[PDB]
């Protein structure tokens, strides 16, 4: 996370590392929407242009970690998946519209002090919190810079990182990239001269962009880290999958499994 900081232990109980079997490496990040389900960004698993089509027989989900690498003996609750659902109208070829995907954990997680679910937003909660200016929290295990020299100031973070980024006006996002922007993707980041920097980066794709409610005190997840033009780049902003728009889907997916 560019210009972010070390996150307090247990600060993000919904964080879900998305691990890769062989090599044992880090592929993405994601939120735990319920002991059963995991919510991540579609392009994390499917993006042909980069030889990227991951099947359930490759992904491991280490949940509730904090350090990026070191195995946390009785805290992280590793897990394998069962089903992978990506949005049918996933436009990877053009501008990654609906970069959302659901991962069905095989065995419902044993909820605990470090493993705890967020709350998907609903009209009420959404309407009040989704106004430009309002900040948000992006947390992931990504690199600290876009490019660098001889690992200066160390690029890859020791533990989970955090950064509260304010949402920007849509007209500003639209006007900052040649790329097509849809209504299923808001953007957030500081404006030039604003003083504060900070933005997700390679390794945070899937990370939950959450926002705490000032009413019912619940931490909601509003966007999934989706795409971006470089990291921390002045004049550029990060695009987050708009969860709420896709809420209807999330439901459609889960309810079909049974009851």
């Amino acid at each position: 996370i560019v210009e972010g900081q070390d996150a307090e232990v247990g600060l993000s109980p919904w964080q879900v590392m998305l691990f890769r079997k062989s090599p044992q490496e880090l592929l993405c990040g994601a939120s735990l929407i319920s002991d059963r389900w995991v919510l991540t960004a579609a392009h994390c698993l499917l993006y042909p242009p980069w030889d990227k089509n991951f099947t359930v027989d490759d992904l491991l989900v280490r949940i509730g970690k904090h350090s990026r690498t070191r195995y946390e003996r009785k805290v992280e609750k590793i897990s394998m998946l069962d089903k992978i659902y990506i949005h049918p109208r996933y436009n990877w070829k053009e501008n990654l519209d609906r970069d959302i995907a659901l991962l069905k954990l095989k065995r419902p997680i044993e909820l605990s002090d470090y493993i705890h679910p967020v709350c998907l937003p609903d009209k009420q909660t959404a309407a009040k919190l989704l106004h430009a200016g309002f900040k948000g929290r992006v947390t992931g295990w990504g690199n600290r810079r876009e490019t660098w020299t001889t690992s200066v100031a160390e690029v890859q973070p020791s533990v989970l990182q955090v950064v509260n980024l304010p949402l920007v006006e849509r007209p500003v996002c639209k006007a900052s990239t040649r790329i097509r922007i849809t209504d299923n993707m808001f953007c957030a980041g500081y404006k030039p001269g604003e003083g504060k920097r900070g933005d997700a980066c390679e390794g945070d794709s899937g990370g939950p962009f959450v926002m705490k409610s000032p009413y019912n005190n619940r931490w909601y997840q509003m966007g999934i880290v989706s795409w971006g033009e470089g990291c921390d780049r002045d004049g550029k902003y990060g695009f987050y999958t708009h969860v709420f728009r896709l809420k209807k889907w999330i439901q459609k997916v889960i309810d079909r499994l049974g009851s």
């Binding site: 307090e8 247990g10 600060l11 705890h116 200016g133 309002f134 509260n164 705490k212 000032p214 005190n217």
Partner: peptide, 28 residues
């Protein structure tokens, strides 16, 4: 609880450093 409530914080009634920022930004 039913969702979005951190044991080690909201439950315990303790706030994390960077939490106050999110609130100040709600000036609207």
């Amino acid at each position: 609880a039913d969702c979005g409530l951190r044991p080690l914080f909201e439950k315990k009634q303790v706030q994390d450093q960077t939490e106050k920022e999110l609130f100040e930004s709600y000036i609207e």
